[PDB]
Design an enzyme around this catalytic site. Structure first.
Site, PDB file in Angstrom:
ATOM      1  N   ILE A  21       0.833  -1.199   0.000  1.00  0.00           N
ATOM      2  CA  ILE A  21       0.000   0.000   0.000  1.00  0.00           C
ATOM      3  C   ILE A  21       0.870   1.252   0.000  1.00  0.00           C
ATOM      4  O   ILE A  21       0.781   2.081  -0.913  1.00  0.00           O
ATOM      5  CB  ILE A  21      -0.969   0.016   1.198  1.00  0.00           C
ATOM      6  N   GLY A  24       7.002   4.560   4.467  1.00  0.00           N
ATOM      7  CA  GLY A  24       7.455   5.731   5.191  1.00  0.00           C
ATOM      8  C   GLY A  24       8.964   5.781   5.299  1.00  0.00           C
ATOM      9  O   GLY A  24       9.666   5.086   4.558  1.00  0.00           O
ATOM     10  N   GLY A  27       9.077   2.681   7.869  1.00  0.00           N
ATOM     11  CA  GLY A  27       7.876   1.871   7.944  1.00  0.00           C
ATOM     12  C   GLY A  27       7.338   1.510   6.578  1.00  0.00           C
ATOM     13  O   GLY A  27       7.763   2.041   5.549  1.00  0.00           O
ATOM     14  N   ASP A 139      -0.556  17.044  15.190  1.00  0.00           N
ATOM     15  CA  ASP A 139      -0.210  16.906  13.775  1.00  0.00           C
ATOM     16  C   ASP A 139      -1.447  16.551  12.963  1.00  0.00           C
ATOM     17  O   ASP A 139      -1.410  15.684  12.083  1.00  0.00           O
ATOM     18  CB  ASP A 139       0.901  15.875  13.559  1.00  0.00           C
TER      19      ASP A 139
HETATM   20  N1  LIG Z   1       2.846   6.083   6.090  1.00  0.00           N
HETATM   21  N2  LIG Z   1       2.352   5.346   5.164  1.00  0.00           N
HETATM   22  N3  LIG Z   1       1.844   4.678   4.224  1.00  0.00           N
HETATM   23  C1  LIG Z   1       1.040   5.454   3.293  1.00  0.00           C
HETATM   24  C2  LIG Z   1      -0.309   4.832   3.166  1.00  0.00           C
HETATM   25  O1  LIG Z   1      -0.694   4.187   4.353  1.00  0.00           O
HETATM   26  C3  LIG Z   1      -2.084   4.210   4.265  1.00  0.00           C
HETATM   27  N4  LIG Z   1      -2.693   3.725   5.473  1.00  0.00           N
HETATM   28  C4  LIG Z   1      -2.287   3.934   6.708  1.00  0.00           C
HETATM   29  S1  LIG Z   1      -0.896   4.872   7.201  1.00  0.00           S
HETATM   30  C5  LIG Z   1      -1.721   6.183   8.126  1.00  0.00           C
HETATM   31  C6  LIG Z   1      -0.846   7.389   8.381  1.00  0.00           C
HETATM   32  C7  LIG Z   1      -1.366   8.585   7.623  1.00  0.00           C
HETATM   33  C8  LIG Z   1      -0.783   8.668   6.225  1.00  0.00           C
HETATM   34  O2  LIG Z   1       0.407   8.888   6.050  1.00  0.00           O
HETATM   35  N5  LIG Z   1      -1.645   8.525   5.235  1.00  0.00           N
HETATM   36  N6  LIG Z   1      -2.945   8.282   5.418  1.00  0.00           N
HETATM   37  N7  LIG Z   1      -3.091   3.320   7.522  1.00  0.00           N
HETATM   38  C9  LIG Z   1      -4.013   2.717   6.822  1.00  0.00           C
HETATM   39  C10 LIG Z   1      -5.092   1.945   7.133  1.00  0.00           C
HETATM   40  N8  LIG Z   1      -5.370   1.689   8.385  1.00  0.00           N
HETATM   41  N9  LIG Z   1      -5.849   1.476   6.156  1.00  0.00           N
HETATM   42  C11 LIG Z   1      -5.578   1.720   4.916  1.00  0.00           C
HETATM   43  N10 LIG Z   1      -4.567   2.440   4.590  1.00  0.00           N
HETATM   44  C12 LIG Z   1      -3.764   2.961   5.514  1.00  0.00           C
HETATM   45  C13 LIG Z   1      -2.298   5.704   4.101  1.00  0.00           C
HETATM   46  O3  LIG Z   1      -3.580   5.975   3.581  1.00  0.00           O
HETATM   47  C14 LIG Z   1      -1.322   5.952   2.993  1.00  0.00           C
HETATM   48  O4  LIG Z   1      -2.018   5.674   1.821  1.00  0.00           O
END
Ligand SMILES: N=[N+]=NC[C@H]1O[C@@H](n2c(SCCCC(=O)NN)nc3c(N)ncnc32)[C@H](O)[C@@H]1O
EC number: 2.7.11.24
Length: 345
Positions: A21, A24, A27, A139
């Site tokens: 998906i 980071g 991560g 944040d």
């Molecule tokens: N960091 N990173 N990965 C990037 C991708 O993780 C996705 N994602 C994350 S991470 C949340 C930290 C905020 C951010 O940074 N973006 N929302 N939790 C997710 C979740 N439970 N379900 C689906 N997608 C997720 C997020 O939507 C982004 O598309």
């Protein structure tokens, strides 16, 4: 062990059919099938143990989310890690699978007024619980607001959170670095360490304006540019607001600027609901002492279709003091180990 895009993803056997998906700095996020519950979940792999601050942020996020339970805050369903500290090199955080986030949504989609109202209500409902726990998110921004296919909104990423401390919030001029630039309140650049709940309300105001036009309201190009954009729209602060800034460097900087008039919100957002713009103005108030608080915002007429204080719960017990800072990464690793033991085996 299943691999994804270069990294190990040691989540077996419960989580299969992994799919990449995102990524980071330290991560990686994948979707996965949870055979036990028969649903696809999100799994975030974290590798923080080489760095002091990554361990801090990981510990904060785990400590807070395990103590919170709220419909508008992303939960932690499971944590996967090695059985011993010696063998623990990564931690896997399992969370509800969400379709998108507000940042990705605003890149392509226009929001109806009903969607704007619904998202804002859910943001403020979750914020009420967070602040009721004496916690500041610090944040808030569109990418930290997750949404599923039925537009349920959940606040995520508490790695930068703090326990509120308004008695120690005053500091000097152009020294603090809190929140992400476009969502950063003006006082951060002026005289605030960001230890008061009004920091979060400003961010929510910036998000609301972005939901109205699909563009950031204060698009500063770097740290020092951000205040230019805020004051370019709000206009010069009043004498009363300047008298509340006792720091001389901060006050004199503001005094050295030419007079700027406030730009009316209805000229910036000609399509917007007038009630939405009234609330926007109260969240994007320059003076943090005059800025609307989360419980007032929930009660604003713009949200009257959803407002229900008996259905806007607060935390069972707040964080009494901030956790930590000068702890070596070895001790932070041990505390992360200890905080994750409840999900073993
Ligand atoms: N960091 N990173 N990965 C990037 C991708 O993780 C996705 N994602 C994350 S991470 C949340 C930290 C905020 C951010 O940074 N973006 N929302 N939790 C997710 C979740 N439970 N379900 C689906 N997608 C997720 C997020 O939507 C982004 O598309």
């Amino acid at each position: 062990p299943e691999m994804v895009r270069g990294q190990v993803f040691d989540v077996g056997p419960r989580y299969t059919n992994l799919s990449y998906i995102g990524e980071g700095a330290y991560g990686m996020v994948c979707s996965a099938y949870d055979n036990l519950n028969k649903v696809r979940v999100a799994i975030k792999k974290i590798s923080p143990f080489e760095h002091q601050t990554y361990c801090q942020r990981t510990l904060r996020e785990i400590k807070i989310l395990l103590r919170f339970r709220h419909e508008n805050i992303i939960g932690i369903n499971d944590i996967i890690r090695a059985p011993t500290i010696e063998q623990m090199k990564d931690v896997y955080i399992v969370q509800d699978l969400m379709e998108t986030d507000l940042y990705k949504l605003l890149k392509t989609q226009h929001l109806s007024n009903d969607h704007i109202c619904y998202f804002l209500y859910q943001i403020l409902r979750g914020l009420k619980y967070i602040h009721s726990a004496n916690v500041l998110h610090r944040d808030l921004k569109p990418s930290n607001l997750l949404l599923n296919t039925t537009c349920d909104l959940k606040i995520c990423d508490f790695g930068l959170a703090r326990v509120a401390d308004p008695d120690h919030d005053h500091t000097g001029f152009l020294t603090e670095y809190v929140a992400t630039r476009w969502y950063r309140a003006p006082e951060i650049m002026l005289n605030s360490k960001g230890y008061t709940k009004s920091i979060d309300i400003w961010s929510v105001g910036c998000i609301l304006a972005e939901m109205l036009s699909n563009r950031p309201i204060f698009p500063g190009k770097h740290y020092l540019d951000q205040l230019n954009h805020i004051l370019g729209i709000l206009g010069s602060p009043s004498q009363e607001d300047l008298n509340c800034i006792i720091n001389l460097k901060a006050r004199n900087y503001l005094l050295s600027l030419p007079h700027k008039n406030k730009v009316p919100w209805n000229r910036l957002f000609p399509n917007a609901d007038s009630k939405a713009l009234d609330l926007l103005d109260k969240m994007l108030t320059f003076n943090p002492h005059k800025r609307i608080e989360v419980e007032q915002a929930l009660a604003h007429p713009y949200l009257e279709q959803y407002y229900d204080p008996s259905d806007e719960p607060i935390a069972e017990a707040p964080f009494k003091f901030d956790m930590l800072d000068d702890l070596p990464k070895e001790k932070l690793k041990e505390l992360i180990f200890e905080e994750t033991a409840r999900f073993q085996p």
